[PDB]
């Protein structure tokens, strides 16, 4: 299947309390593998997955130096945007950036991207061509003109198509045992009563990797994604994920409803009923 | 290998 390398960056000002908080968090697919946090006692880039021990001291030194550099540019960005939007110095503001590339199973580039947000709203984004930017408002239009006259798109393009891709391949190789494994879901169904002769049935899926999964409830072969409550697939603290999906049914008619689990580690999808 | 430059806004 496809793989991705992504870096989540956040800068958050806190007037009266010192310098903005700056964080970088990197993921290979759905696994966190590196992080930087300015509020650590000794802010360094750190490994978050066991396989990253295969990198030497120079790797960590370089990443740390980048992060400290990036930190400062975002402190300046925060000030700049107060000007663009005519905002006072007394309020907290957030800049978020997502950058990444994705490859097929053969290691070839599928797509690269970089998008910025200010206070939780779209600011500026690299287009799918990797040559031009698109700007959500006139503040970001100023940024767009700056980056065009500087030719920034071209440098970023070279990173996404070259560096990002090659290091992603390297990580998938070094972390093979972890990143290309498949842990199969284990499922079960729970039962909860309700006021008016009705019952909640909840289908759980546990211990699976990768995160992509599909849970559905069925009555008479038709999928019931109408009255289905759901949580987003969520990390379980050990490298695996879990999910649940629930449906409200008539009391005494529980046996006519089936849960279906689809996962790449399930050659044939699971089918479960509620068992007394 | 993280991006080493985020140009200023």
């Amino acid at each position: 299947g496809p793989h991705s390398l992504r870096y989540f960056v956040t800068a958050v000002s806190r007037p009266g309390l010192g310098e903005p908080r700056y964080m970088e968090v990197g993921y290979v697919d759905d696994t966190e593998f590196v992080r930087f946090d300015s509020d650590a006692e000794n802010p360094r880039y750190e490994p978050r997955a066991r396989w990253m021990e295969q990198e030497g001291p120079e790797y960590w030194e370089r990443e740390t130096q980048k992060a400290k550099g990036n930190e400062q540019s975002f402190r300046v960005d925060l000030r700049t945007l107060l000007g663009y939007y005519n905002q006072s110095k007394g309020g907290s503001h957030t800049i978020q950036v997502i950058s990444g590339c994705e490859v097929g199973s053969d290691g070839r580039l599928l797509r690269g991207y970089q998008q910025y947000a200010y206070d939780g709203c779209d600011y500026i984004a690299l287009n799918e061509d990797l040559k031009t930017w698109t700007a959500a408002d006139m503040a970001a239009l100023i940024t767009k003109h700056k980056w065009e006259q500087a030719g920034e798109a071209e440098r970023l393009r070279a990173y996404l198509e070259g560096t990002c891709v090659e290091w992603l391949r390297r990580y998938l190789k070094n972390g093979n045992a972890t990143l290309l494994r498949t842990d199969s879901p284990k499922a079960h169904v729970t039962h909860h009563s309700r006021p008016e002769d009705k019952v909640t049935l909840r289908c759980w899926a546990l211990g699976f990797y990768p995160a992509d999964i599909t849970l559905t409830w069925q009555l008479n072969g038709e999928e019931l994604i109408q009255d289905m409550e759901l949580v987003e697939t969520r990390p379980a603290g050990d490298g695996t994920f879990q999910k649940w999906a629930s449906v409200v049914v008539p009391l005494g008619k529980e046996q006519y409803y089936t849960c279906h689990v689809y996962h790449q580690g399930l050659p044939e999808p699971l089918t479960l009923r509620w068992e007394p | 290998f993280a991006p080493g430059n985020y140009p200023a806004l």
């Binding site: 956040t10 993921y27 957030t94 939780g120 729970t190 546990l206 990390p235 379980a236 879990q242 | -």
Partner: protein, 99 residues
């Protein structure tokens, strides 16, 4: 933009008394990012709780996970207390082992 966090509390394995496990508190879909997140055992702070899996979705709202190793017992209760600007009071969400 302001978004109230969803607060989900769950264990890695189905809970059996006396068996080591992992308790999770996943706080999601919130903005602004400033937040306080405490995992509690019998109303008391659990020390050395790990913070991981910080990310954001396509609408930019924040996601983050708190987790700790633990061995449940019949009598012990666990909860996750979150403070965020979108809320008047702190929200204490208890772990429901029968969910």
């Amino acid at each position: 933009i302001q978004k109230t966090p969803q607060i989900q509390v769950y264990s890695r394995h189905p809970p059996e008394n006396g068996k080591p496990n992992i308790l999770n508190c996943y706080v999601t879909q919130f903005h602004p990012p400033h937040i306080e997140i405490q995992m509690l055992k019998n109303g008391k702070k659990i020390p050395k709780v790990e913070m991981s899996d910080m990310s954001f979705s396509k609408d930019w709202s924040f996601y983050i996970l708190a987790h700790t190793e633990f061995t449940p017992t019949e009598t012990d209760t666990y909860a996750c207390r979150v403070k965020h600007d979108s809320m008047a009071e702190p929200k204490t969400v208890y772990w429901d082992r029968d969910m």
